[PDB]
Amino acid sequence: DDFLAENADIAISNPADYKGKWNTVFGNDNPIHIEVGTGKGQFISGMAKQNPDINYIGIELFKSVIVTAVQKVKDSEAQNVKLLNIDADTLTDVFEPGEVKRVYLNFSDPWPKKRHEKRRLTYSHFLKKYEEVMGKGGSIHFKTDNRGLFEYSLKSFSEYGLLLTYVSLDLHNSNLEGNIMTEYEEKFSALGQPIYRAEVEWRT
Amino acid sequence: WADDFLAENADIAISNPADYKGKWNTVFGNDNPIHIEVGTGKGQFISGMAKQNPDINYIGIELFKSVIVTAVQKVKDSEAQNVKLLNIDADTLTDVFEPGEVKRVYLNFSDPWPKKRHEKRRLTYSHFLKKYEEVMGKGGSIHFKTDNRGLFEYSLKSFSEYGLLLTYVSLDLHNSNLEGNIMTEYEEKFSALGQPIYRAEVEWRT
Numbered sequence A: 001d002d003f004l005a006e007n008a009d010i011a012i013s014n015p016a017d018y019k020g021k022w023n024t025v026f027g028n029d030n031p032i033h034i035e036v037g038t039g040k041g042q043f044i045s046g047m048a049k050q051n052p053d054i055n056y057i058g059i060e061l062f063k064s065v066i067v068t069a070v071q072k073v074k075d076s077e078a079q080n081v082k083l084l085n086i087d088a089d090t091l092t093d094v095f096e097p098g099e100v101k102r103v104y105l106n107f108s109d110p111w112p113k114k115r116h117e118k119r120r121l122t123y124s125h126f127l128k129k130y131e132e133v134m135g136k137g138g139s140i141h142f143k144t145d146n147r148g149l150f151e152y153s154l155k156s157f158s159e160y161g162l163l164l165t166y167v168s169l170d171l172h173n174s175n176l177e178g179n180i181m182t183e184y185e186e187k188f189s190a191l192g193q194p195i196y197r198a199e200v201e202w203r204t
Numbered sequence B: 001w002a003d004d005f006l007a008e009n010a011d012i013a014i015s016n017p018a019d020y021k022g023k024w025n026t027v028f029g030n031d032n033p034i035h036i037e038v039g040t041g042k043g044q045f046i047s048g049m050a051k052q053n054p055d056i057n058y059i060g061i062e063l064f065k066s067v068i069v070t071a072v073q074k075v076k077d078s079e080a081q082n083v084k085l086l087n088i089d090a091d092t093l094t095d096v097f098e099p100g101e102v103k104r105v106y107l108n109f110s111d112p113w114p115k116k117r118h119e120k121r122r123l124t125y126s127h128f129l130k131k132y133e134e135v136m137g138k139g140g141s142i143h144f145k146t147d148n149r150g151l152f153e154y155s156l157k158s159f160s161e162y163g164l165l166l167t168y169v170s171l172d173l174h175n176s177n178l179e180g181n182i183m184t185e186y187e188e189k190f191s192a193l194g195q196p197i198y199r200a201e202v203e204w205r206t
Ligand SMILES: C[S@@+](CC[C@H](N)C(=O)[O-])C[C@H]1O[C@@H](n2cnc3c(N)ncnc32)[C@H](O)[C@@H]1O
Pocket: A036, A037, A038, A039, A040, A043, A059, A060, A061, A062, A065, A086, A087, A088, A089, A106, A107, A108, A109, A121, A182, A183, A184, A185
């Protein structure tokens, strides 16, 4: 509610208004990379610090957790990060085709039961939404430790016709140049459970 | 001594497979689907599958005659009549089968050839994928198990690049509910290691 209003510079209260004008909000034409399901915001803050020449937008359905995320963006003074308290279905209300250059998905809600397939952020509907905002010059960068979700996601990507250009089935034992760990990633890393990673892009 | 053993057991190990191209149903005495395995090895998998699925006809191919001898003996030891073995490489598959004659291709713990210059020796590289298409047409599938993370990672990208559809994927087969999974010789060793077994099913887009 009212700590968001106070930090309305980082947390945009009316994101529909900047559809086709996100460059003005950032004051440059640096590529815009979004994250769907930011959570506490460790990943978006690290990536912001690491890549000053990319503009980051985090979207999170819960205000309770997006609050922790604005604090992390306020704490590291990264000026290249904004946060939206919106649902993934409103993405098309907020972005014109080609305005987004890349979509990050990090440890998304698995919804493992068949009947809840359409809640999964890798389901074809959400894939179409990412296409609408990237056109076909986009990519999706996905990591999770959930075996069921990754295996579902691989099938989903394949079914939609996306091209798999990167896949790790044990990310921590793969050569990552500057992979920023998410909150979830740091917990599961200790476990020895493998972290799954895919890059998919639209076929030219 | 391998050549002579194969000669005495020519009923199971077909010495001239090109001669049966388009007529494999006559060799089996039925129109049951023919599933093939490229890289049979010692033949545990194909013997188990034969015995489990008497309504499927199985053909194993193995380049090494050293190991295909062990495979003949396992096929002889289990009196499965729905299995033949060919001592041929994967390139020769088109000389042996007409399009659609093969319904399914099994790949089991194939040589990983990890270095970039050896990509073309990998049984999931686009050239071999083209060969499987030639013998299955576009109503086939490829059933693939391996313990090698590098090879599975590469294979997923290869399948995707060729335009195949991924319809099943397990990243931990032994902790997945698989009904009638037949372990290969290599698979049984790795099952006891906590090492995960990777499985994909991939089919042609229609
Ligand atoms: C399990 S948490 C992972 C958080 C963070 N990415 C990490 O890896 O540490 C997944 C997040 O996705 C968010 N989420 C799920 N569906 C969403 C949607 N449609 N729109 C926005 N956020 C969503 C959830 O609220 C939750 O915060």
